[PDB]
Amino acid sequence: EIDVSYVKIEEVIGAGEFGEVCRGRLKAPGKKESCVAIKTLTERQRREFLSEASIMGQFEHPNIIRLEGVVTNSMPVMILTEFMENGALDSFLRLNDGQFTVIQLVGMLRGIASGMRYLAEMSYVHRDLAARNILVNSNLVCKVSDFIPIRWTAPEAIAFRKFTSASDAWSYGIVMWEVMSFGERPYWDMSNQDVINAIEQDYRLPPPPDCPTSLHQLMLDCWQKDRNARPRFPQVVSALDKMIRNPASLKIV
Ligand SMILES: COc1cc(Nc2nccc(Nc3c(Cl)ccc4c3OCO4)n2)cc(OC)c1OC
Numbered sequence: 001e002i003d004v005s006y007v008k009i010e011e012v013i014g015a016g017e018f019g020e021v022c023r024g025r026l027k028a029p030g031k032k033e034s035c036v037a038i039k040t041l042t043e044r045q046r047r048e049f050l051s052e053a054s055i056m057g058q059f060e061h062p063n064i065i066r067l068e069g070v071v072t073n074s075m076p077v078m079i080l081t082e083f084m085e086n087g088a089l090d091s092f093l094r095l096n097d098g099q100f101t102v103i104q105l106v107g108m109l110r111g112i113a114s115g116m117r118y119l120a121e122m123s124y125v126h127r128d129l130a131a132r133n134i135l136v137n138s139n140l141v142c143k144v145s146d147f148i149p150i151r152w153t154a155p156e157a158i159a160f161r162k163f164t165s166a167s168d169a170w171s172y173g174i175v176m177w178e179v180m181s182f183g184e185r186p187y188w189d190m191s192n193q194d195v196i197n198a199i200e201q202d203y204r205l206p207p208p209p210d211c212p213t214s215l216h217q218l219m220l221d222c223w224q225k226d227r228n229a230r231p232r233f234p235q236v237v238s239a240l241d242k243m244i245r246n247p248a249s250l251k252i253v
Contacts, residue, residue: 002069002080003028009038013087018049019076023083026068035083036068040076053079055147059122063115065135065145084135084143092136094183100140102212102250105179108142109215110240115144116172117233120165127163128152129171131178150192151185155199156227166227172236173222174205180215181208212250214243 006028014021019040027033041049056067056079071078086092089108093100100108112134119126126133126144133146148158154170156162174186186205187195204223207216218239224230231239243249 002026002071002078004071004074004078007036007038007071007078007080009040013037018045024080026080034068035085036080037083039079041078046077049077049079052147056081056145058124059118059147061115061118062141063111063143064118065143085138086136086140088132089134089136089142090131090178090183092183093131093179097182102210103244103247104140106215106240106243106250108136108140109176109179110237110244111142112144112175113172113233113236113240115142116168117237119144120168120233125163125165126168126171127157129168129175131175131183134175151187151190151195154227155196155225158196164227165233166230169222169230169233169236170227172233173219176215176219176222177205177208180211184208207253210253212243213252214249 006026008025008027009022010025011023012020013023016039022038022040024036024038025033026036039049050070050072053067053070056065060066065084066082068080068082070080116126116129126146128146128149129144130149130152133144134142135145136142150158152171152174154167157164157167157170177186178184187198190198204220207213218231218236221229221231222236
């Protein structure tokens with residue numbers, strides 16, 4: 001896939017499941033140099049590592065992390081993607097607590113919803129939609145990555161392992177809550193089991209401080225117990241676009 005001579009690993013920036021995550025530079029003949037994220041790396045686990053690239057490589061969308069390639073004929077085995085300068089959304093927001101406007105936050109949520117709209121249209125169920133799995137670039141563009149998280153997971157998917165695009169819509173509501181709360185943990189210190197019982201007993205997360213009521217209502221819609229009643233991702237995007245068109249709507253809190 002990618003000639004190893006074309007890759008320069010600069011800084012180690014994080015740690016992943018199978019190894020490091022690094023910032024680097026990719027320069028191939030005919031093409032300008034670009035900034036890349038690089039994951040570096042059991043046999044079964046090697047295919048486990050590389051599967052992420054194969055899935056990621058099925059997708060082409062501005063709100064889904066772009067795969068540049070892999071290094072496999074050489075060692076260490078690598079996966080290269082575009083570089084997202086601002087990292088994971090939950091930590092980026094915690095660092096920037098209170099510092100982005102409602103309209104900026106809605107833009108981030110819209111980018112995430114578009115990503116999910118695309119994946120649902122491709123019949124791809126994510127199963128692990130959470131702000132930690134959303135990456136942010138220098139322009140604040142949010143992209144879905146990562147190809148049972150109890151507090152993000154729909155009640156039926158927990159009970160039955162029924163993962164659908166409608167269970168993803170539940171998870172997206174949780175992401176909305178995370179974004180509007182600037183990266184607070186869903187259900188704070190409640191335990192997984194407490195969360196499981198709380199939801200079954202009709203508890204839902206309250207509006208975050210300063211959260212427009214219309215955004216909280218959209219969260220409640222995403223968290224309907226009847227999965228068929230939840231908005232599909234096209235309706236989610238359209239709702240968010242409506243709010244962007246009509247920012248007046250967002251002042252009610
Ligand atoms: C600046 O701080 C951080 C940046 C960052 N950026 C980033 N960008 C693209 C991908 C990625 N992780 C990744 C993923 Cl999620 C899937 C597959 C990959 C990956 O790298 C190549 O193969 N990271 C990421 C940071 O950590 C979240 C970060 O702070 C440490």
